[PDB]
Every structure is written in C-alpha cells, then in structure tokens.
C-alpha cells in the first residue's frame, strides 16, 4: 500500500530516485546531437544504442548518490556496476512497463511507444523473444502489485547482489545486503494484504530478471561480433569488462 511504517532505507531510496521528466528530456537532448551515420545501418539502431547508454548514465548517477555505495572506493564501485549493469537496465525497462503499461506496446525512456506487432515483424527472433519474455515479468509484477517502495528496494538489492569475495570492503557491503533484504521483508510483511510470500515472490522475479539480463548481453555480444555496435559504446565497454 502506502506506509505509516516504511523501512528507513526505503524512505531514503525514494528521495534518491531521479525525476522521470528531466531524465527523459536530458536523454532526448543527448539523442539530438549530430552523428556520423553509417550507410549500412538504419539510423534508428544507433540512436537506440545511445538511448540505452544514456539510460545507463542516469543509472550510474543514481548509484553514486546511494547510501553505502557512496562510502565505497572507485575499485569496488566499478566491480558492483560491472556485475549488475544489464540487470539494472532490464529492471528499469520492466518497471517502466509496469508504471505506464499498455499490453499491446512497450514504452521507451524517450516517451515513444513501439507496438509488439512492430517488433514481431521487424525484429529478429532473439530480440523478439527478449521483449516477449520481459513482458511476462511485467505481467507477473503487476499481478504481485509491485509498488514504488518495493521497486527502489529491489534496485538497491540488485546493485549489491554480488559475492563478497570479489570486493575489498566486505563488512560494508555485507551489511548493505542484509539491510536491503530485511527492508524488503519488513515492508512486504507489513503491506501485502493478500496471501503468498511476496518477499520470496519478488526475489524469484529477480532470478528471472538476471536470466533475462544474461540473454540481453548475448544479444549485445552478437551485434558486437558483427561490428554492428557504434564505436565507444558504453554498454559494450561494460560487456567487455572482466567478469567477476
């Protein structure tokens, strides 16, 4: 629901969440910049790549001003991001469909709608599958009645969903994971008016988000091998980072 008693971590995360209007304008403005369009590709492909890059830019900004994360060193900060970047982008996309959702189309961060019929006839089987799978998560999260409080908590959980051995500051990150889960559990137990373990049901979704994110990287990798990606693409840099 709303919350007379909302976990402090969640309340703070709500205030750290960027404004969708200014994010949209900033990205729209970024896409307006003139570019060297290659003649062997639809111009839309390059723009969509840049759009996703700028989306990740805004996501990195969000992480930077997060509690605990801001108290970390650049070494650990990069490690966390290099591990959860695709997951955060996918989850961003998914929640966008939850907020503003017609079942016949998907909404992009720029504000433009693409009907599923377009994707079915214009996209390859891989991307088509990714979009359809993502919509299944959206449908499930709507059924579970995902709200803003849970979304920001889930994002935070995603950010720190890593094995402690790959980081330098164990205690600080370990504490964050425990607090994040506790917050999610506390909120769901206090707010879910239905039956079913919402805390566990949401964590199951994260498992699917992560698997969905894996396939997205495979899509990016395929385009990368075919020299289809624009040079100095941020996502490809993230994809080419050493895996932890």
């Amino acid at each position: 629901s709303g919350g007379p008693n909302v976990p402090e971590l969640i309340l703070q995360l709500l205030q750290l969440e960027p404004d969708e209007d200014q994010v949209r304008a900033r990205i729209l403005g970024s896409l307006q910049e003139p570019t060297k369009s290659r003649p062997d590709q639809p111009a839309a492909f390059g723009l969509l790549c840049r759009m996703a890059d700028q989306t990740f830019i805004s996501i990195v900004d969000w992480a930077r001003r997060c509690m605990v994360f801001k108290e970390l060193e650049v070494a650990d900060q990069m490690t966390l991001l290099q591990n959860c970047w695709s997951e955060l982008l996918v989850f961003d996309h998914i929640y966008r469909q939850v907020q503003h959702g017609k079942e016949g189309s998907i909404l992009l961060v720029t504000g433009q709608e693409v009907e599923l019929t377009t994707v079915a006839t214009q996209a390859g089987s891989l991307l088509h599958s990714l979009v359809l799978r993502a919509q299944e998560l959206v449908l499930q999260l709507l059924a579970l009645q995902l709200d803003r409080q849970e979304f920001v908590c889930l994002k935070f959980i995603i950010l720190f969903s890593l094995d402690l051995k790959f980081l330098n500051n164990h205690i600080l990150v370990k504490d964050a994971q425990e607090k994040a889960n506790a917050a999610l559990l506390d909120y769901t137990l206090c707010h879910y008016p239905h039956s079913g373990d919402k805390f566990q049901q949401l964590l199951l979704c994260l498992v699917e988000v992560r698997a969905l994110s894996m396939q997205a990287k495979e899509y990016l990798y395929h385009k990368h091998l075919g020299n289809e990606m624009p040079r100095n693409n941020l996502l490809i840099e993230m994809l080419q980072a050493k895996q932890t």
Binding site: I57, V60, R64, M78, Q82, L234, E237
Partner: peptide, 12 residues
Amino acid sequence: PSLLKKLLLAPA
C-alpha cells in the same frame, strides 16, 4: 582509461 571510471570520478 574507461568511460565508467571517468563517470564515477565526475565532480557533479
């Protein structure tokens, strides 16, 4: 060296 590092080291 990397865009990600230059992004985290940004002043704003």
